[PDB]
Amino acid sequence: MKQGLQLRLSLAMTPQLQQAIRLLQLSTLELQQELQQALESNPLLELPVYQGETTQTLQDYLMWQVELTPFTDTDRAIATSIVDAVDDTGYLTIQIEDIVDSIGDDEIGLEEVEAVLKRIQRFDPVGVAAKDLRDCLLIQLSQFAKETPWLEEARLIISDHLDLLANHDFRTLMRVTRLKEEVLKEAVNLIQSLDPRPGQSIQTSEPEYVIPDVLVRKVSGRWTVELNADSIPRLKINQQYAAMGNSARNDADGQFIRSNLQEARWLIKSLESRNDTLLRVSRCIVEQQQAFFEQGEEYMKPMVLADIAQAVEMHESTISRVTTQKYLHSPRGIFELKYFFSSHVNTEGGGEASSTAIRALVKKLIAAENPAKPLSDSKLTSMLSEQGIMVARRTVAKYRESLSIPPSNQRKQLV
Amino acid sequence: VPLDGGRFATSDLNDLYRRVINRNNRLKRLLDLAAPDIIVRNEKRMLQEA
Amino acid sequence: TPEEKLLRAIFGEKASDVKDSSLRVPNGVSGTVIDVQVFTRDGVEKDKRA
Amino acid sequence: KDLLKFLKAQTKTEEFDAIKIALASPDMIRSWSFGEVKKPETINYRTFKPERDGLFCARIFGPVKDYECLCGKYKRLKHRGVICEKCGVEVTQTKVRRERMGHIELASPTAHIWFLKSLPSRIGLLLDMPLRDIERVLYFESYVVIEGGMTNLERQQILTEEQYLDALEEFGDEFDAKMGAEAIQALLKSMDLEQECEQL
Amino acid sequence: KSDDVNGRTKMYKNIVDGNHQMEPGMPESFNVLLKEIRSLGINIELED
DNA sequence: AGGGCTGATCGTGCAAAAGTCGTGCCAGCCGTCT
DNA sequence: AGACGGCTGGCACGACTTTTGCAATCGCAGCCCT
Numbered sequence: 001m002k003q004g005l006q007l008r009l010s011l012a013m014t015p016q017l018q019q020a021i022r023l024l025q026l027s028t029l030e031l032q033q034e035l036q037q038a039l040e041s042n043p044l045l046e047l048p049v050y051q052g053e054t055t056q057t058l059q060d061y062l063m064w065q066v067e068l069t070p071f072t073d074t075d076r077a078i079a080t081s082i083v084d085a086v087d088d089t090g091y092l093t094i095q096i097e098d099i100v101d102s103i104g105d106d107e108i109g110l111e112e113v114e115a116v117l118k119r120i121q122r123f124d125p126v127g128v129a130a131k132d133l134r135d136c137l138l139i140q141l142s143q144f145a146k147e148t149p150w151l152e153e154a155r156l157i158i159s160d161h162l163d164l165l166a167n168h169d170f171r172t173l174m175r176v177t178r179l180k181e182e183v184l185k186e187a188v189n190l191i192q193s194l195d196p197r198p199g200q201s202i203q204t205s206e207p208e209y210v211i212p213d214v215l216v217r218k219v220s221g222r223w224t225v226e227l228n229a230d231s232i233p234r235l236k237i238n239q240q241y242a243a244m245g246n247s248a249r250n251d252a253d254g255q256f257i258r259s260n261l262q263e264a265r266w267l268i269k270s271l272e273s274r275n276d277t278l279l280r281v282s283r284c285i286v287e288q289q290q291a292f293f294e295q296g297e298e299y300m301k302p303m304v305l306a307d308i309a310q311a312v313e314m315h316e317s318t319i320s321r322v323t324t325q326k327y328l329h330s331p332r333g334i335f336e337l338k339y340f341f342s343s344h345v346n347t348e349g350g351g352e353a354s355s356t357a358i359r360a361l362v363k364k365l366i367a368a369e370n371p372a373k374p375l376s377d378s379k380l381t382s383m384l385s386e387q388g389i390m391v392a393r394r395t396v397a398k399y400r401e402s403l404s405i406p407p408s409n410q411r412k413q414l415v
Numbered sequence: 416v417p418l419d420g421g422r423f424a425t426s427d428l429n430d431l432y433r434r435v436i437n438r439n440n441r442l443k444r445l446l447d448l449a450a451p452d453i454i455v456r457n458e459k460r461m462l463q464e465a
Numbered sequence: 466t467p468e469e470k471l472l473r474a475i476f477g478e479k480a481s482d483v484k485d486s487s488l489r490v491p492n493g494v495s496g497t498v499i500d501v502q503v504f505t506r507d508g509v510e511k512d513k514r515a
Numbered sequence: 516k517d518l519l520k521f522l523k524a525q526t527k528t529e530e531f532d533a534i535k536i537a538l539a540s541p542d543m544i545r546s547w548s549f550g551e552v553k554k555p556e557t558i559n560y561r562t563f564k565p566e567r568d569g570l571f572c573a574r575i576f577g578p579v580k581d582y583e584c585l586c587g588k589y590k591r592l593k594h595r596g597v598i599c600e601k602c603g604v605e606v607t608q609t610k611v612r613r614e615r616m617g618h619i620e621l622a623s624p625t626a627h628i629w630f631l632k633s634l635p636s637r638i639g640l641l642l643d644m645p646l647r648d649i650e651r652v653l654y655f656e657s658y659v660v661i662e663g664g665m666t667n668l669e670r671q672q673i674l675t676e677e678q679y680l681d682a683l684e685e686f687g688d689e690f691d692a693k694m695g696a697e698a699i700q701a702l703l704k705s706m707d708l709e710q711e712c713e714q715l
Numbered sequence: 716k717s718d719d720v721n722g723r724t725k726m727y728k729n730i731v732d733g734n735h736q737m738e739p740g741m742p743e744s745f746n747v748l749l750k751e752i753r754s755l756g757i758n759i760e761l762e763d
Numbered sequence: 764a765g766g767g768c769t770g771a772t773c774g775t776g777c778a779a780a781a782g783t784c785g786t787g788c789c790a791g792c793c794g795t796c797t
Numbered sequence: 798a799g800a801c802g803g804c805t806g807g808c809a810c811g812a813c814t815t816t817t818g819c820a821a822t823c824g825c826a827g828c829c830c831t
Contacts, residue, residue: 012774013820022775023817029561036555040441043454050416067728077518084582084592089481091468094591102593103518133472166474171794196472197481204484208420211560217508244453253451273775304813317777320815331508343785343813355785376803395786397805407804409794410474423558432570433555436619440553443622456655459623459695463653526721528741531761539758547753610720616750627756 017263021270025278027325028213028231035233038267044241044257045264058202059086065123071116078103078116082129090199092117092131126198133196134162140194150187153179158191165191168410185414212329214279216286216293223290225328227279235268237261277314281322282337284311289340292357293330298364300357302344345395348388358384358391359399366405374411431465438462516595525608548618550575574603577612624696626653642702648673652698660692661701671702718743 014022024031039045054060066079081102085094096117100108121129121139130136137158141151148154157165157177164173165188174181195201216225245257285308286293292300305323309316326337343355365383369375375383377400381393389396405411417423442458473480490496503515554569565573565585573585583590586602594606605611631638631653636646651657651673658679660668666686668674674682674692682690693701719740729736752759 012776014776015774015820018774018776019818019820029559033556036437040437040444041448043441043445043450043458050418052416064724067724068731073519077522080522081518081592089469094593098593102591105517105519133468133475162471162475166471168474169794192476196476196479200481201485204486206420206484206486207563208417209422209560211421241454244451248451250451253453256451270775277775305815306813315776315778316813317815318775321775331506341814345785377805378803391785392787394788394805398785401805406474409804421560425557429557429570432552433557435621436552436555436569439619439621439623440555446622456694460655462621462623463625463696529761530763531741533762535760535762537758539753539756543758544756614746614750616753629755 017266018270021267021274022321024270025274025321025324029211030325032233035235035271039235042260042264042267044238044245044260045267046236046238056202058088058090058199059083061202062086062120062124062128066120069119069123071119074105074107075112075116078108078113079120082117082120086129086199088200088203089197090126090128090130091136091197092129095131126201127195128199134158136196136198137191137194140198148190150184150190153177153184154187154191157184157187168413170414182414188414210329210334211327212334213326214282214328216282216328216330218294218331223286223293225279225283225286227275227282232275233271235264235271237264237268277318278322278326281308281312281314281319282326282328284308285337285340287311292340292354293332296332297360298357300342300354300360302342302352302354302357303340304344305341308341346390348385348390355395355399358389359402361387362396362399363403363405366400366403371411371413372415374408376408434465435462438465521595544618547616548575549615550617552617552619575617576615578604578607578609580609582606624700626696626699638699638703642671642699642706644671649699652694653696655694658692658694659698659702660690661698662705663690666690 024034062083063080066076066083071079078099081099082092085092085099087093094102096110096113100110100113103113117129121127127136127139127143130139138155141155141158144151157173157179161173161177164170164176173179174184177184179187211231213228213231214225215228216223218224241257242261245254245261248254248257288301288303288307288311305316305319309319312319314322323337323341327334328337339356342357344352345355345358347353362380362384365380366375377393377397381389381391381396384391384396416425438458438461442455442462445458446455469481505512505515550568550572552569552572552575554566554572556566557570558564559566565571565579567573568575573579579585581590582592582594584599584602584604584606586599588601589597589599589606596605596607598605626638631646631649636649638644638649639646642649648657648659652659656676658674658676660670660672660674660682662670663686664670666682666689668682668686668690674690679692682692692698719742722738722740725738728734749759
């Protein structure tokens, strides 16, 4: 306004201490390791008994079958080598030639290795070590009874018509195999129930860990959030060390204690401020993401980093630092902090939509479709434009790739 | 021996090794920094009792 | 994963996405179910037949 | 490896008669161990993988559940004893994890609680010192004298903090004394056995 | 009937083959005992 | 006897170049109907 | 049986993101060089 100079009264270059403090808040579990590392340097800052029960582990069964089955010593070694080349799904990871090379025996021939592999295939109750989907299907068909509807047709299709089934080219398969129309569907359905990856049944393991860091939930009609008390690290100044340093007879020892106390106080203040800033940022993010929190992913507001930065006094750089490897648990579930931010899509009615919400709606529409006639990407684009997509189906194509949606030709199948 | 699945929470064998390891690390790091005799002696006594 | 992609194009709807963690009766127990109950936390409304 | 004797080599045991017992030596402890732990971390919840240089860590205690190396490369039975470069891990069975003990350096000296605490004081009967003196000097609050014959002081006598400071004040840097386990270690290493045996 | 890992499989093989023959091995619990004693500053080993 | 000058102490950002996506747009191709 | 079509994938471009690389000016005074 009016030109003038300073007529009444009213910034900082953060050094390595505050600089590393800013470099902090990148993670939480990793932050604990660095905090322990600093606390090591800083001296003024502070039967029925459950034991593991062995399991088959999808390989001890194979070893037990090998031991029980009668095999030669060389045959036993080859069987052990084959068991080494195993997968959780149940297919042989390494090639037969690879097994022969690893054997390192002039005698070791491909015929003996093949005989051992064939014996092992029928050895375990679950058909395994097929190393080929066609081989596994053939093993399943052989195990299946001879008196089956279109069993020979299904075997012929599995033999060399795997590609036709892969592309769902039913017309091409019917033309090539000269199979019966609308009757080969029975053979296809029978082939569908062939237990692919049979070994995976013996494999079972789950994480059962989320390690939550924040807790936000609806209460009294409003979303309330709080940092996880257990997860947040805490530091305490060593009172005994502070007392010793204050009354230290040696001047040098007292000065060193004072320097250590200053460093520890700076670190503690930085940690507390980082935690508080993260809490405030999470509260601000929730204030605007309550719609997605309550209604679901479809009601996700298109939000950017600057949008969150505007509601707070911190910069977008602080927003990025806060939105770094942070996971928050809520009634909906566990989600990353960065998952909140989404692209803005122009839409009918003037509003902008979150690209994540658009992809979720697209997936919901695609799943709820007639299996006989799969929706075209152009058709899906028109359907979303009926809701105001303002998209050219290239972004829809990218979203479908993100969701691994198959082609309209591929999605279609026999009814 | 995981109890909750999320946290294994070893006890009676590993908390002791954890204490000894961290205390020895702090003493070894501190001994190289020409610490005052009182603090290093107290840390050594902590290590011995651990 | 070309093998897994081929399997999914053939069978699909499993894609080895889920492992069987179904609740099965331990051996040596035979009986008749009297009744089941389900408790769902607030915020989730799946309620398929709850 | 012919792969026909390697499997036969694992399942073997000795005659194993005449079991003995003796005190252990630091060199034997070093020979027993393969690596040294340095971090209190045991397992990571970010990847559920063995830590680095700590409890349950790789490059010590042996491999992980399979012949697969922790880095991810060299994962097959074709490799029998090779050690990868990005990760130092012997490609073997998992059972060996129950047969590899670790070691920690522990730069500061430390006494062994099984000794000097049972009914007979091994340190006490070795040094002819009362137990009270040995536990008082074991905790940095007794300041026993180590040596010094020029001064009018006994070889093995208790000199409290005030006593130690004044003794160093008048006698100068001659009455050497220590307050930790290294004091006991020095007093015990710097003594003959046959001469005292003959005297007794 | 015990911790002997190399004995259980061998005896199962002999029984299913109808051999009824015994191979002793050495218990794993004694190995645990040795490892636990060696954890203390006490050397213990097996002679010949 | 007078000048040089020496090291203590200090400090929640940002911006600038780089990257990187959202969206659209073009080229080809194969299933197909002609 | 050569062309329609929808897919898919490569290509490009402004518009959101973000990360690292900086580490200012300040009053004491006694000691060393001239």
